[PDB]
């Protein structure tokens, strides 16, 4: 079976077969669509085969199916399941099986750069400390003085599920929040529940509205351990607009590096509980969510303060007028400072590029429209126009819970 | 099976019911989602007719009631003997209504009970098609202080006698290919404004020519007939800063009707039915002016903004984006010709949502079209889980008539 999708604003078509690879489940039925829904201890049982799976697909890709090196694998992990009930990935499997995550990544929209992924295999790391040590090296290496690297690090792979390695921050680097008690916030209101984990952990805040979060990382299934990156590896922004000289007294800034450190790699089978991975910002999920949601640092309302906009009614969209010059002033900052980012209309015209190249040379590219057009000004942007189809791959990055609720505390 | 929805800017959470009395499917399966795809006899009719007559004798607190066995024993009849069955005016009123109730890709639905349901089930020629149109749309404009309707025509018999409005719109502006290369007046009307003069229509090639309407009663050739101007509300469209703005020459018209859906209804198919309401700003601001594929007037927009057009990271075109939506604003509540911008109208479906998840037990939702098409983010409606489900009453997409009708 094959199925097709039209961009309705040059009237492209292309043919997906792509889909009839797709195994997991996506959260729909035939009488229910879940498309706008957030997020909808393995035994050998199961294991083997998807582990066949995997390595059927690698030595697909090398040109090499079927071979001698391909059957040998196939037993070799066979009876390396059967007797000790897991298995080793080889750094080549590795390699592809993060590349591919990435390329599968079906709301990612930065996926044209899948290919180009620095992967540091950190599966001999045993402690927190060693964790702070590769993790610090993933930043610079990633940061690059601000010509920015995609880059992933992995740890040691699930085992029982009670000896997991976790990075329990959300991202790498992040701005802590601080709830108040007159109820209102101090920092980012996103990472006050995390700030608050930190302090108790014995995170001496300085409480500032900017103050980068320490690393709280777990090894082995033991309790995790509080490091503060060397302040000379996190490359930071002051956020200023080209017209607006006011803007600057905002205080703004923003670090470089978006770095993702809180989901699950899944490949062959294997769980890769910490598997931190970063790459560079496209310009509204600094100036759209980061500084305009109203649960975020909602600066909306003082930005329109001081263009002087006509705030009484909405119908005057000063909401829309001032998240424009906010999305300005980010992207002008970073290029001003020589730091890698992208804006919304090259990102996406990029992604259409890359998703009708993936339908030629693989057969499809799943994609998430609701996660994939940009959260300001959709439909000037050509993914808007753009049907897509919704399915997961194998390898992918996978949701987890927060490991605070998981843990069984040591003490 | 009992299935919650989460909105993330609030952690407000509702519980939906209403989802388990879906009927017909989405296109989605288990593998695959399809949210973002734009379109996917006697004994089938009796069932369907006992699913709407229950749900209305429910409404009204009469399920179970002699009026509503005597009702149903007499459709049950009525299809028996002539293969179809005629809805009482009150059953056709609540089945319009709910056909709006369950659009899930509306955005303006919590005006849902407030419809005007005209009835022009006894009519028969396009001359008299024309005479209820011009009906709908004098009272549906109401001098600017517009108002919801929907006219319903005879419903489909054999597929030979359909009724079709062959306009999308009952009021669009025309659509003419250049010989020099590109498109004059707007291009999404193009083949339509072909056929029109292609009919008969004598065009006067500019840029806002308001179409011909065009008419096809009982299966029978459709015919051409001008809306009078002085039903047609059109606003012309200024800035309230940028006095060039007036220069640029656009307008639009204050009415959007749409014409070319098929009304279903306890199993019957009500082919032609144009219903209309009130404009949301961006409907045409971000679409009908600035979509590539449309009027395209971004460029020089932003030309006459003397804004930096030489690299996308300066954001010229959501620059001028904002600007040219401030003015339709501006434009419509200037002329007080009613419009809603796309932060009251999602506020207002948020409200919408929660009396549907309150007083029903749930609320269809397309997330993927609810949205608006700028500024998303910054409207409540983002961060809002929607699950999308079909249940009738519904109106449904059908095919165009050309390339259908037996000329
Ligand atoms: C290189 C530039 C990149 C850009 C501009 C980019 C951009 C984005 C954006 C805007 C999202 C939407 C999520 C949100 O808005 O919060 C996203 C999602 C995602 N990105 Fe990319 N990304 C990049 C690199 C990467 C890399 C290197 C990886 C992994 C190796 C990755 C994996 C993902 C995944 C798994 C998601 C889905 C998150 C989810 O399922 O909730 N991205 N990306
Ligand atoms: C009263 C104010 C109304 C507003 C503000 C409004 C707004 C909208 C918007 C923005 C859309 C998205 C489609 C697009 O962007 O072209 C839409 C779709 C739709 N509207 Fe409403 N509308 C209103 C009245 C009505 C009425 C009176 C009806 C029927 C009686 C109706 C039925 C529909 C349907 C069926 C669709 C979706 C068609 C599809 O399935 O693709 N609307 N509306
Ligand atoms: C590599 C990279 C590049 C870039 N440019 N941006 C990002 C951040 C986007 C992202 C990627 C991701 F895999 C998971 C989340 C979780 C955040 C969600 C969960 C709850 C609140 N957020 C909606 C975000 C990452
Ligand atoms: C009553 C009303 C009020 C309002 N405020 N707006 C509208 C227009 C929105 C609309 C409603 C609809 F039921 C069908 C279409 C078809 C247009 C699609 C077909 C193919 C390409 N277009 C996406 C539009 C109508
Ligand atoms: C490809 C995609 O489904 C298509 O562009 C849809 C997306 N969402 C939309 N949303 C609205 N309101 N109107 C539209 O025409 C569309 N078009
Ligand atoms: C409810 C809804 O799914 C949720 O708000 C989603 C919508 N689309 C998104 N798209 C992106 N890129 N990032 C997001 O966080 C979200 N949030
Ligand atoms: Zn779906």
């Not at 002033?329 to 090259?346: G, R, W």
Request: net charge neutral; aromatic share 12%.
């Amino acid at each position: 079976r094959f199925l097709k999708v039209k961009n309705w604003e040059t009237d492209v078509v292309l043919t997906d077969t792509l889909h009839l690879k797709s195994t997991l489940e996506t959260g729909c039925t035939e009488h229910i669509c879940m498309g706008s829904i957030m997020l909808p201890v393995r035994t050998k049982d199961q294991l083997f085969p998807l582990a066949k799976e995997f390595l059927d697909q690698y030595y697909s890709s090398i040109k090499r199916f079927g071979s001698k090196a391909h059957m040998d694998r196939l037993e070799e992990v066979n009876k390396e399941i059967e007797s000790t009930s897991t298995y080793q990935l080889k750094d080549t499997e590795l390699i592809y099986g993060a590349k591919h995550a990435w390329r599968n990544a079906s709301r990612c929209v930065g996926r044209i750069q899948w290919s180009k992924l620095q992967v540091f295999d950190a599966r001999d790391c045993t402690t927190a400390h060693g964790m702070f040590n590769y993790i610090c090296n993933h930043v610079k290496y990633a940061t690059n003085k601000g010509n920015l690297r995609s880059a992933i690090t992995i740890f040691p792979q699930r085992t029982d599920g009670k000896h997991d390695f976790r990075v329990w921050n959300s991202q790498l680097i992040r701005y802590a929040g601080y709830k108040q008690p007159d109820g209102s916030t101090l920092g980012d209101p996103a990472n006050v529940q995390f700030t608050e984990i930190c302090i108790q952990q014995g995170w001496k805040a300085p409480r500032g509205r900017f103050d980068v979060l320490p690393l709280l990382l777990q090894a082995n299934g033991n309790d995790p351990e509080l490091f503060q990156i060397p302040p000379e590896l996190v490359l930071e922004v002051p956020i200023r607009h080209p017209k607006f000289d006011w803007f600057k007294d905002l205080g703004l800034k923003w670090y470089g590096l978006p770095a993702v450190s809180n989901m699950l790699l899944e490949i062959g089978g294997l769980e890769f509980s910490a598997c931190p991975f970063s790459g560079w910002y496209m310009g509204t999920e600094i100036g759209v969510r980061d500084y305009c949601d109203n649960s975020r640092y909602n600066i909306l309302e003082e930005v329109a303060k001081k263009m002087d906009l006509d705030m009484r009614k909405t119908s005057s969209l000063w909401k829309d007028q001032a998240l424009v010059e906010i999305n300005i002033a980010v992207l002008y900052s970073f290029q001003s400072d020589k730091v890698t980012i992208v804006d919304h209309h090259s990102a996406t015209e990029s992604f259409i590029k890359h998703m009708e190249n993936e339908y030629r040379c693989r057969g499809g590219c799943p994609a998430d429209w609701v996660w994939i057009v940009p959260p300001m000004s959709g439909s000037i942007t050509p993914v808007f126009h753009q049907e897509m189809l919704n399915y997961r791959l194998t390898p992918s990055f996978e949701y987890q819970p927060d490991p605070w609720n998981t843990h069984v505390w040591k003490g």
